[PDB]
Amino acid sequence: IVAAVSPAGGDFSDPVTTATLGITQVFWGLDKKLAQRKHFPSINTSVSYSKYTNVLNKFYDSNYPEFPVLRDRMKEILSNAEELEQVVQLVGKSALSDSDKITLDVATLIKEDFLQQNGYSTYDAFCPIWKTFDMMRAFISYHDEAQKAVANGANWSKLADSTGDVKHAVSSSKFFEPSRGEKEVHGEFEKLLSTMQERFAESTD
């Protein structure tokens, strides 16, 4: 069963929502802000939760061992980005380290590319599990490579100029419509990842 509670004005003050939360296992809250900005999937990634993550690892490891750790890393990235945003407004983005800007831009890229999707374009109607896995790998690998590169000493401002190409590549990766090979797409993603590594290595010079 997939119930659908209706907002009663206040976010959660209504008792029906409290009672449902008391029993329901998976909850997908609503975000006012994203709706105001036409970010159609308005799931708030701060309150929603699901308790079947614990058990689903048994299926995950049989086919895709990397979902748990990668998902946790993405959630940590998003939480860090939002908490930083909490304070950045009161002052301004002037006294920020390279890693801070990296995290902020990565979070923005994920939120505007990974999360967003319109249920009307053919390439975006249904996203298979494997495609989501590969596109997630792309983003997290990009982020960790950038973090490693800056950690060893470099100015991310200069590096970003070179990276713009691969950044656009990963941002456009979603447009790979499924239902073409179901495996050739995986090869394309692997080639993109290898080329990203190569481009960072050469540009890192």
């Binding site: 004005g9 206040g10 976010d11 304070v87 009161l90 002052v91 002037s94 006294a95």
Partner: protein, 218 residues
Amino acid sequence: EQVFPTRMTLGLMKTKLKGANQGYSLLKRKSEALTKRFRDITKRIDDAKQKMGRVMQTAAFSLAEVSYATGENIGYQVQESVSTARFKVRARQENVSGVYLSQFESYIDPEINDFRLTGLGRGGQQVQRAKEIYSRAVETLVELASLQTAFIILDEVIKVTNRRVNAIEHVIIPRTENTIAYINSELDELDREEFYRLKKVQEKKQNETAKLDAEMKL
């Protein structure tokens, strides 16, 4: 003491209170650090200007003395023969603490070598000899100018931040907490009349049922 939105808006106002507290503390500490760094800039610019006041005089007076020593002051030639500047100015970028500073740097410009003033013989060597000592105060002067600009920028920044903190503390928090109290009072008021109404209906029901079953004993 505000526009009064009474529609279960407590969470929003509490969030505003927390944000106000956080911003207040952060700006307080930022102002502390900026003032601490302002003090040292003041001291160092004072000392640099004071010592330059006499370093320049000794340099220029020695240059004039050597100019007279040859017996032929070269003021006219250096007044008409000079073509291009020996020093160029470049803007220096730096963030002393949080605030980004558009400081100035002593960008020497050796693109033009020492001016071709030597050639008079006795004074040809002495003019360039005293040029170096006369070319020494330029670096101190540009350092002093950079310190002056940094001083002005720091002063205005700290003034702005301090007044903003004072305004926040003395205006925002009272305004929001009074509204908090008002909202709490209204939400406490509603339940009172709701309870009265429920009590009315309950007493009506119990009284009528007791009356109806009273006769049933017979």
